[PDB]
Amino acid sequence: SGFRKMAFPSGKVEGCMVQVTCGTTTLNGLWLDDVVYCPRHVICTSEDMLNPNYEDLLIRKSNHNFLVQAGNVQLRVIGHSMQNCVLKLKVDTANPKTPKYKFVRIQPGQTFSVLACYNGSPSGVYQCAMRPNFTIKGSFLNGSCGSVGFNIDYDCVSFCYMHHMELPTGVHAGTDLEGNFYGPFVDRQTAQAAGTDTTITVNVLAWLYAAVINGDRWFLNRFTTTLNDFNLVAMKYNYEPLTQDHVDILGPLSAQTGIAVLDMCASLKELLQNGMNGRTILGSALLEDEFTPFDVVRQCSGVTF
Amino acid sequence: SGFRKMAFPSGKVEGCMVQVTCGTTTLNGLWLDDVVYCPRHVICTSEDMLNPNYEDLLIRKSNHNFLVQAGNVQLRVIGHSMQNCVLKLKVDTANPKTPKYKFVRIQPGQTFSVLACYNGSPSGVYQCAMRPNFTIKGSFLNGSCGSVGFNIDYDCVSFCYMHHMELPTGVHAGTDLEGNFYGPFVDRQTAQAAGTDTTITVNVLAWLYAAVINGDRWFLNRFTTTLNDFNLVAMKYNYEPLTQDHVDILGPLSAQTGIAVLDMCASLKELLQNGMNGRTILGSALLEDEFTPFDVVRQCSGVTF
Ligand SMILES: *C(C)[C@H](C[C@@H]1CCNC1=O)NC(=O)[C@@H]1[C@@H]2[C@H](CN1C(=O)[C@@H](NC(=O)C(F)(F)F)C(C)(C)C)C2(C)C
Ligand SMILES: *C(C)[C@H](C[C@@H]1CCNC1=O)NC(=O)[C@@H]1[C@@H]2[C@H](CN1C(=O)[C@@H](NC(=O)C(F)(F)F)C(C)(C)C)C2(C)C
């Protein structure tokens, strides 16, 4: 028993982290096969980042301008190209620790483990949910760019996030591994703000199922509801509309606990209208929406990798 | 910016996890050099665990009764010995992924990363604080025993916890890597309960410093206090007495923020007497005590490994 925010084991990703230095700017890169992926603002000076012309900056750089270091070993750059907001550096050495991997673009509401890195060295790992406003509530300092987010399916590492920038509210924005930003953000040091966020309803329900599985059942009421009714009450509290796809995705948890999704919706409806009355659910005084239905099943069934 | 519960990168520990099977019982083991460490109740049947005589059970086992598997490779056991509640299995192969490591017995209030494992395979990683009652608020299922807790200092992995059992309240208890349990618990399936826990005061203060560093300063009041006065107010709320050693340990954070420890104690004194008034600190509606002063510095300064 027990339910904890749980990151994937980072070993497979730790073996892919390198340091990328261009001039005086240093950040992290992902070394997969003979290609190093890193944010393209590695080629910017502190002045360029205010309004950079990345295509122009990349002209004046040759392969030798990019210092790639895996540990103490320098990786010789034999090619460079820009794909959206990511820079692809071809190196003369294929990473022998390359895991089976994919590049995926996750959807809002899905979670992933972030391996925070500095100077190509892993610092720590934590879980993040892609917020509906396409930000993540991460912990990133100077030099953390290039740190990647990932999920692990058996032996396959699905990279889905590379860190680029921090927004005024302290939240963070980045790109997929193809360099496409999540959300309407750009890799320029200019006025940008995250849109108004919303609560990932399906994840709250998943978390309530986790609570029941772990013996925390005080919030279960006698009632049921309809998908239409619940969504009208949840809309007021800035909850995403619960779709039938979300109901279907919760099926496994509903079947395991014997609590219909719409019965759990009634309990959440009451929690949203009446509050928690000073009580906790899984030790939390707030409703948690950063656990996907998969995260709950994975943790309550012990899926390994 | 941003402050998150952050685990150490688990790669160095993932390379040491093996599966240990004795008869029908399977759990995890730590493979360091040519020795596999695992809980001794691997040698118990479901019946033995109610009142096991481990010394007796170990008589009837020979080296070949212990099936150790690193991945698909079986490690041949060439020796076995029992140290307290841990079993040491000598194998004919030294783990080539053995990191620089130590065995340490952490103190109550210190944190460590847990690598949850099943069948010798890492499932996930999360941070845990050794509670004053010598339990941890973990997430463990059947077959999770042998999962270890650790800290990483540069390149040295300090193993400090091996999981053994779960207590009635859903909290968890285990041993150091020498087999000595944390707390008054025994590896027997019998009536055992965790003592009344207490709040790790120094960690709350560290967490309040983290809040200030991250711009959350609404709780800072104009007052100071004395170590004696604060401790008398904090005692009522089940807070550990704050020692001068704790004040000294907070020095780095006090110096970085320019807020004296006793000034922060006054702010915590007010938070304990008046509550948070529906507000959050670092997104939390409760005061967090699972962040050590080191954890805060490590995360707010970007210490890597
Ligand atoms: C990557 C190394 C670094 C990570 C951030 C530094 C502190 N915390 C982080 O997450 N990214 C940057 O420095 C990016 C880069 C330059 C400016 N920048 C920012 O993150 C800045 N934010 C913004 O400009 C915005 F729009 F998000 F508000 C700032 C946090 C440094 C002010 C690039 C876009 C090239
Ligand atoms: C290790 C494989 C396993 C981990 C627990 C199973 C579920 N969650 C866990 O953390 N440990 C055990 O099964 C230990 C073993 C047997 C009984 N046991 C327990 O954890 C049991 N708890 C207790 O007896 C006590 F005292 F903590 F309440 C129980 C949770 C299975 C009932 C040993 C002590 C040999």
Curated annotation (Swiss-Prot), chains A, B:
Domain of life (superkingdom): Viruses
Peptidase C30 domain ranges (all copies): 1-305
Record text on activity regulation: Inhibited by pyridone-containing alpha-ketoamides compounds 13a and 13b. In turn, alpha-ketoamide 13b (tert-butyl (1-((S)-1-(((S)-4-(benzylamino)-3,4-dioxo-1-((S)-2-oxopyrrolidin-3-yl)butan-2-yl)amino)-3-cyclopropyl-1-oxopropan-2-yl)-2-oxo-1,2-dihydropyridin-3-yl)carbamate) inhibits SARS-CoV-2 replication in human lung cells. Inhibited ex vivo by michael acceptor inhibitor N3. Inhibited ex vivo by compound 11a and 11b.
Self-association and partners: 3CL-PRO exists as monomer and homodimer. Only the homodimer shows catalytic activity. Interacts with host FBXO22; this interaction promotes the proteasomal degradation of nsp5.
Location in the cell: Host cytoplasm; Host Golgi apparatus; Host nucleus
Name of the protein in question: 3C-like proteinase nsp5
Active-site residues from the entry: 41 (for 3cl-pro activity), 145 (nucleophile)
Boundaries of the shown chain within the full protein: 3264 to 3568 of 7096
Function of the molecule: Cleaves the C-terminus of replicase polyprotein at 11 sites. Recognizes substrates containing the core sequence [ILMVF]-Q-|-[SGACN]. Cleaves and inactivates human TRMT1, preventing tRNA guanine(26)-dimethylation of tRNAs. May cleave human NLRP1 in lung epithelial cells, thereby activating the NLRP1 inflammasome pathway. May cleave human GSDMD, triggering alternative GSDME-mediated epithelial cell death upon activation of the NLRP1 inflammasome, which may enhance the release interleukins 1B, 6, 16 and 18. Also able to bind an ADP-ribose-1''-phosphate (ADRP).
Organism: Severe acute respiratory syndrome coronavirus 2 (2019-nCoV)
Catalytic activities: TSAVLQ-|-SGFRK-NH2 and SGVTFQ-|-GKFKK the two peptides corresponding to the two self-cleavage sites of the SARS 3C-like proteinase are the two most reactive peptide substrates. The enzyme exhibits a strong preference for substrates containing Gln at P1 position and Leu at P2 position
Effect of residue 205 to V: In strain: Zeta/P.2
Positions in the Cytoplasmic compartment: 1-305
Cross-link Glycyl lysine isopeptide (Lys-Gly) (interchain with G-Cter in ubiquitin): where in chain: 5, 90
Phenotype when changing residue 189 to A: Does not affect ability to cleave and inactivate human TRMT1
